[PDB]
Scaffold this active site. Structure first.
Site, PDB file in Angstrom:
ATOM      1  N   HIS A   1       4.927   5.499   2.546  1.00  0.00           N
ATOM      2  CA  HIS A   1       4.981   6.739   3.335  1.00  0.00           C
ATOM      3  C   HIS A   1       5.918   6.544   4.520  1.00  0.00           C
ATOM      4  CE1 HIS A   1       2.087   8.584   0.836  1.00  0.00           C
ATOM      5  NE2 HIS A   1       0.972   8.377   1.597  1.00  0.00           N
TER       6      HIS A   1
ATOM      7  N   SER B   1       0.691   3.696   1.825  1.00  0.00           N
ATOM      8  CA  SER B   1       0.989   4.113   3.215  1.00  0.00           C
ATOM      9  C   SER B   1       2.263   3.415   3.696  1.00  0.00           C
ATOM     10  CB  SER B   1      -0.128   3.807   4.183  1.00  0.00           C
ATOM     11  OG  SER B   1      -1.344   4.452   3.764  1.00  0.00           O
TER      12      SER B   1
ATOM     13  N   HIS C   1       0.697  -3.685   6.387  1.00  0.00           N
ATOM     14  CA  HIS C   1      -0.638  -3.628   7.037  1.00  0.00           C
ATOM     15  C   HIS C   1      -1.753  -4.181   6.185  1.00  0.00           C
ATOM     16  CE1 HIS C   1      -0.469   0.022   4.660  1.00  0.00           C
ATOM     17  NE2 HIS C   1      -1.800   0.067   4.637  1.00  0.00           N
TER      18      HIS C   1
ATOM     19  N   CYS D   1      -6.844  -3.445   3.413  1.00  0.00           N
ATOM     20  CA  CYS D   1      -6.642  -1.980   3.347  1.00  0.00           C
ATOM     21  C   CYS D   1      -7.273  -1.428   2.084  1.00  0.00           C
ATOM     22  CB  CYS D   1      -5.196  -1.601   3.525  1.00  0.00           C
ATOM     23  SG  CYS D   1      -5.193   0.247   3.497  1.00  0.00           S
TER      24      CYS D   1
ATOM     25  N   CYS E   1       0.856  -1.193   0.000  1.00  0.00           N
ATOM     26  CA  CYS E   1       0.000   0.000   0.000  1.00  0.00           C
ATOM     27  C   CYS E   1       0.889   1.240   0.000  1.00  0.00           C
ATOM     28  CB  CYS E   1      -0.929   0.005   1.195  1.00  0.00           C
ATOM     29  SG  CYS E   1      -1.894   1.499   1.464  1.00  0.00           S
TER      30      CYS E   1
HETATM   31  N1  LIG Z   1      -7.670   6.571   4.733  1.00  0.00           N
HETATM   32  C1  LIG Z   1      -7.193   5.288   4.712  1.00  0.00           C
HETATM   33  O1  LIG Z   1      -7.591   4.449   5.494  1.00  0.00           O
HETATM   34  C2  LIG Z   1      -6.180   4.980   3.640  1.00  0.00           C
HETATM   35  C3  LIG Z   1      -6.026   3.623   3.188  1.00  0.00           C
HETATM   36  C4  LIG Z   1      -5.158   3.291   2.135  1.00  0.00           C
HETATM   37  C5  LIG Z   1      -4.428   4.306   1.623  1.00  0.00           C
HETATM   38  N2  LIG Z   1      -4.502   5.586   2.128  1.00  0.00           N
HETATM   39  C6  LIG Z   1      -3.783   6.609   1.412  1.00  0.00           C
HETATM   40  O2  LIG Z   1      -4.419   6.864   0.174  1.00  0.00           O
HETATM   41  C7  LIG Z   1      -3.474   7.355  -0.789  1.00  0.00           C
HETATM   42  C8  LIG Z   1      -3.515   6.557  -2.048  1.00  0.00           C
HETATM   43  O3  LIG Z   1      -3.002   5.243  -1.788  1.00  0.00           O
HETATM   44  P1  LIG Z   1      -2.736   4.234  -3.008  1.00  0.00           P
HETATM   45  O4  LIG Z   1      -3.898   4.188  -3.907  1.00  0.00           O
HETATM   46  O5  LIG Z   1      -2.154   2.993  -2.397  1.00  0.00           O
HETATM   47  O6  LIG Z   1      -1.566   5.099  -3.698  1.00  0.00           O
HETATM   48  P2  LIG Z   1      -0.988   5.233  -5.169  1.00  0.00           P
HETATM   49  O7  LIG Z   1      -1.015   3.954  -5.915  1.00  0.00           O
HETATM   50  O8  LIG Z   1       0.316   6.011  -5.007  1.00  0.00           O
HETATM   51  O9  LIG Z   1      -2.035   6.147  -5.926  1.00  0.00           O
HETATM   52  C9  LIG Z   1      -2.012   7.578  -5.832  1.00  0.00           C
HETATM   53  C10 LIG Z   1      -2.261   8.149  -7.216  1.00  0.00           C
HETATM   54  O10 LIG Z   1      -2.202   9.575  -7.105  1.00  0.00           O
HETATM   55  C11 LIG Z   1      -1.697  10.104  -8.303  1.00  0.00           C
HETATM   56  N3  LIG Z   1      -1.200  11.470  -8.084  1.00  0.00           N
HETATM   57  C12 LIG Z   1      -0.019  11.853  -7.451  1.00  0.00           C
HETATM   58  N4  LIG Z   1      -0.041  13.180  -7.465  1.00  0.00           N
HETATM   59  C13 LIG Z   1      -1.151  13.669  -8.065  1.00  0.00           C
HETATM   60  C14 LIG Z   1      -1.690  14.953  -8.436  1.00  0.00           C
HETATM   61  N5  LIG Z   1      -1.028  16.025  -8.021  1.00  0.00           N
HETATM   62  N6  LIG Z   1      -2.919  14.931  -8.938  1.00  0.00           N
HETATM   63  C15 LIG Z   1      -3.612  13.831  -9.311  1.00  0.00           C
HETATM   64  N7  LIG Z   1      -3.143  12.588  -9.081  1.00  0.00           N
HETATM   65  C16 LIG Z   1      -1.963  12.561  -8.445  1.00  0.00           C
HETATM   66  C17 LIG Z   1      -0.594   9.099  -8.742  1.00  0.00           C
HETATM   67  O11 LIG Z   1      -0.205   9.226 -10.060  1.00  0.00           O
HETATM   68  C18 LIG Z   1      -1.216   7.724  -8.290  1.00  0.00           C
HETATM   69  O12 LIG Z   1      -1.797   7.042  -9.366  1.00  0.00           O
HETATM   70  C19 LIG Z   1      -2.087   7.371  -0.120  1.00  0.00           C
HETATM   71  O13 LIG Z   1      -1.846   8.663   0.506  1.00  0.00           O
HETATM   72  C20 LIG Z   1      -2.347   6.382   1.032  1.00  0.00           C
HETATM   73  O14 LIG Z   1      -1.449   6.595   2.152  1.00  0.00           O
HETATM   74  C21 LIG Z   1      -5.384   5.929   3.055  1.00  0.00           C
HETATM   75  O1  LIG Z   2      -3.133   2.830   4.306  1.00  0.00           O
HETATM   76  C1  LIG Z   2      -3.762   2.904   5.597  1.00  0.00           C
HETATM   77  C2  LIG Z   2      -3.124   3.892   6.553  1.00  0.00           C
HETATM   78  C3  LIG Z   2      -3.688   5.113   6.878  1.00  0.00           C
HETATM   79  F1  LIG Z   2      -4.864   5.479   6.339  1.00  0.00           F
HETATM   80  C4  LIG Z   2      -3.101   5.996   7.679  1.00  0.00           C
HETATM   81  F2  LIG Z   2      -3.692   7.126   8.032  1.00  0.00           F
HETATM   82  C5  LIG Z   2      -1.954   5.626   8.297  1.00  0.00           C
HETATM   83  F3  LIG Z   2      -1.342   6.499   9.217  1.00  0.00           F
HETATM   84  C6  LIG Z   2      -1.321   4.501   7.949  1.00  0.00           C
HETATM   85  F4  LIG Z   2      -0.132   4.134   8.553  1.00  0.00           F
HETATM   86  C7  LIG Z   2      -1.927   3.588   7.137  1.00  0.00           C
HETATM   87  F5  LIG Z   2      -1.309   2.455   6.825  1.00  0.00           F
HETATM   88 ZN   LIG Z   3      -3.056   1.082   3.454  1.00  0.00          ZN
END
Ligand SMILES: NC(=O)c1ccc[n+]([C@@H]2O[C@H](COP(=O)([O-])OP(=O)([O-])OC[C@H]3O[C@@H](n4cnc5c(N)[nH+]cnc54)[C@H](O)[C@@H]3O)[C@@H](O)[C@H]2O)c1
Ligand SMILES: OCc1c(F)c(F)c(F)c(F)c1F
Ligand SMILES: [Zn+2]
Ligand SMILES: NC(=O)c1ccc[n+]([C@@H]2O[C@H](COP(=O)([O-])OP(=O)([O-])OC[C@H]3O[C@@H](n4cnc5c(N)[nH+]cnc54)[C@H](O)[C@@H]3O)[C@@H](O)[C@H]2O)c1
Ligand SMILES: OCc1c(F)c(F)c(F)c(F)c1F
Ligand SMILES: [Zn+2]
Ligand SMILES: [Zn+2]
Ligand SMILES: [Zn+2]
EC number: 1.1.1.1
Lengths: 374, 374
Positions: free
Chosen positions: A51, A48, A67, A174, A46
């Site tokens: 990150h 995250s 995770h 996730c 993922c």
């Molecule tokens: N809230 C939660 O529980 C949760 C769960 C899983 C992931 N997350 C977060 O969600 C986000 C996405 O995760 P993912 O899908 O695994 O990531 P990912 O595969 O990196 O997807 C993100 C997308 O954003 C695109 N991108 C980057 N910059 C820009 C821009 N400026 N404008 C438009 N598109 C852009 C990029 O090209 C990519 O396809 C990350 O920040 C994760 O940490 C949160």
């Molecule tokens: O991708 C899920 C996820 C989150 F949404 C967070 F906010 C976070 F802090 C993290 F560690 C995480 F794994």
């Molecule tokens: Zn995640």
């Protein structure tokens, strides 16, 4: 035979930010009371997890991250009642203690036992089950799935269908559940509505799947990588836009495209600027915007509160708003019954030993989900 | 007869910012098609009117301000169907055109015909019905109630009960309906919940009334002016707190008092810092915060989006979320049927000629609502 004994196994240890994972032997202590030791079968990568590497997310190092996974219970500690040895299980990065005010609330899921708000990188008892080179190693979100064996608190594990394909359902841990719940549960996307999804990675594709399941008439994907658009359309996007193609800011473009703003927007990236752009592009009087992306550590966004005063709703969620332990088994059951698809999110499969290649694929832009097999 | 003729009457003209109103003769044109000319009976003094004087709110000057009023139809333009001469009416500072995507939406009230977002200070047709000393004078929000006579578009007026006491029901034109609806409609306060209300003026007291009507178990009033506490308790506050009494930030105090955060918080002041404090003091997983206070022109707030990612909902609204033309007559009927009280909000009743004294009472902290009688 391994019950009550330390297990030596391979894990991916992150010693330092901005460095490859080190695949090396760790010692995994046996489970204490209300703990569960799991032999991992499959874990997703993922953003995250990335990150943690980049320092976008701050958690104590050294760490065993991961995770998004599934495995098989190796042993249970004293007093465990909800899983048994040999059960297929998903570690829950958002716990469900079932006792706190959030767990009791009909709409709460961010259980007060979480290790996300102010990460300690421990078990619930403040200690670690992991040793490497004789040094204690941090947990991550109470899960630490980048290891052949992990130990989790009972409130951080769900029993799932014994006939589950773990190499698929790890995504329920996730990315799928987050995106799909963010649409169906958090935003409550309506039939006939117009949605905008910022970021077309695994999570944003899952948001699209939820918006389509909810009946949205229009689902506009937004990404600066146009290579992401074909898959977005396959799972339900009606059109895709790349902000880099336009002279004007994309909130203005989306407002024009939607004849005055979208019904529902989703930030699925992790940028402060796209969180504000996503809010702005939903209709000013009745629009809803959901923050899904993880923001950079300790940074504040700037916005004009008139965006809210006119009537917008702004909210965020962890894990799609799902109460984790109640929801993960149901989601697995629904997947077994073909109520949604996971294959569109899986672009690459690698052995666990090729974790760094998995992260390279995510950072290059090539992958959605790489699934690592133990 | 005055119908079809220019009326010369008295009005309170605001020629420039940060000066007293000028009480003097203006000419009021007759209503054009789909317009209504109203003899004003009573108008409240809302803080939003003071924002025009202070420059907190930007609207074209010179202007006849005032937006919280009631009066009696003097005449109607060609094509008016919803009011007639002699009718008691409330001008609607948020219109209800009935045709726009917002008016058609079940949860929208911020009609696209509004003159708030990007104020022109005119009638719908982009002209003014007011002159003073040979100069055109701007309208305010389509209402301009600080005049013995106004002209409003039909979509900005509602007919109300002929037996309505206009010296009380004028508050249904802004401050009562805004605060009450912010609680009952926009936040959807639940039975048994804990609420925090920041700002205990006319609007914040109406938020308390709504929270109590919705069955909240606890309603914590927050004001820096402890003289506001007695009346807040009278209308339902269970506790009042003055931030100036504490060494800690009040979000921390309120989180401690509510055993982990409130269910519902309301910003009813108009400060960027209190909008962020009010969001923070609601429970992180399931709390709701509503912005009611009008922020100062063109200023952004700073906030950490983790406040929303955990599960908070942040929203704002104009006029309590009420679709104005449908709602106002029903609110007046409910008042007539003793469903809620308005007297608690009225601290002073002055002739219109004492408008400046009424504003001084607001600015000094003494008053809640002064009603001006024509
Ligand atoms: N809230 C939660 O529980 C949760 C769960 C899983 C992931 N997350 C977060 O969600 C986000 C996405 O995760 P993912 O899908 O695994 O990531 P990912 O595969 O990196 O997807 C993100 C997308 O954003 C695109 N991108 C980057 N910059 C820009 C821009 N400026 N404008 C438009 N598109 C852009 C990029 O090209 C990519 O396809 C990350 O920040 C994760 O940490 C949160
Ligand atoms: O991708 C899920 C996820 C989150 F949404 C967070 F906010 C976070 F802090 C993290 F560690 C995480 F794994
Ligand atoms: Zn995640
Ligand atoms: N959204 C709407 O449709 C709408 C409607 C009516 C009014 N408003 C706005 O609502 C706000 C309140 O209006 P009102 O009730 O007529 O005003 P008011 O009577 O001035 O009440 C404001 C209260 O805030 C108190 N206060 C000031 N600073 C602070 C602080 N730092 N901390 C805690 N309390 C503080 C102050 O003592 C006073 O009692 C104003 O900004 C209005 O412009 C908005
Ligand atoms: O008090 C009602 C009210 C508002 F809520 C505003 F946002 C505003 F701009 C204004 F002029 C006004 F009168
Ligand atoms: Zn809990
Ligand atoms: Zn309208
Ligand atoms: Zn007002």
């Amino acid at each position: 035979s391994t019950a009550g004994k330390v297990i030596k196994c391979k894990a991916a240890v992150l010693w330092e930010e901005k460095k490859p994972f080190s695949i090396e032997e760790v010692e995994v202590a046996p489970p204490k009371a209300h703990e569960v030791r799991i032999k991992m079968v499959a874990t997703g990568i993922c953003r995250s997890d990335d990150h943690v590497v980049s320092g976008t997310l701050v958690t104590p190092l050294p760490v065993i991250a991961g995770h998004e996974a599934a495995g098989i219970v190796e042993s249970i500690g004293e007093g465990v009642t909800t899983v048994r040895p040999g059960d297929k299980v998903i570690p829950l990065f958002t716990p469900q203690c079932g006792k706190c005010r959030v767990c009791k609330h009909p709409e709460g899921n961010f259980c007060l036992k979480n290790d996300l708000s102010m990460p300690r990188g421990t078990m619930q008892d403040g200690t670690s089950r992991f040793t490497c080179r004789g040094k204690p190693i941090h947990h991550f979100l109470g899960t630490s799935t980048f290891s052949q064996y992990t130990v989790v608190d009972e409130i951080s594990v769900a029993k799932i269908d014994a006939a589950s394909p773990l190499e698929k359902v790890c995504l329920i841990a996730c990315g799928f559940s987050t995106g799909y719940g963010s649409a169906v549960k958090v935003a409550k996307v309506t039939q006939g509505s117009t949605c905008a999804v910022f970021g077309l990675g695994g999570v944003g594709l899952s948001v699209i799947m939820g918006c389509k399941a909810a009946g949205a008439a229009r689902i506009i994907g937004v990404d600066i990588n146009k290579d992401k658009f074909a898959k977005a359309k396959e799972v339900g996007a009606t059109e895709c836009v790349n902000p880099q193609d336009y002279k004007k800011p994309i909130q203005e473009v989306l407002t024009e495209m939607s004849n005055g703003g979208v019904d529902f927007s989703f930030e699925v990236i992790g940028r402060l600027d796209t969180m504000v752009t996503a809010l702005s592009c939903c209709q000013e009087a009745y629009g809803v915007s959901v923050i899904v992306g993880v923001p950079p550590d300790s940074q504040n966004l700037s916005m004009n509160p008139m965006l809210l005063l006119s009537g917008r709703t702004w909210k965020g969620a962890i894990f799609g708003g799902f109460k984790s332990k109640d929801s993960v088994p149901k989601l697995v059951a629904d997947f077994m019954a073909k109520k949604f698809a996971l294959d569109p999110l899986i672009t690459h499969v690698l052995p666990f030993e090729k974790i760094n290649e998995g992260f390279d694929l995510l950072r290059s832009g090539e992958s959605i989900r790489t699934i690592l097999t133990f």
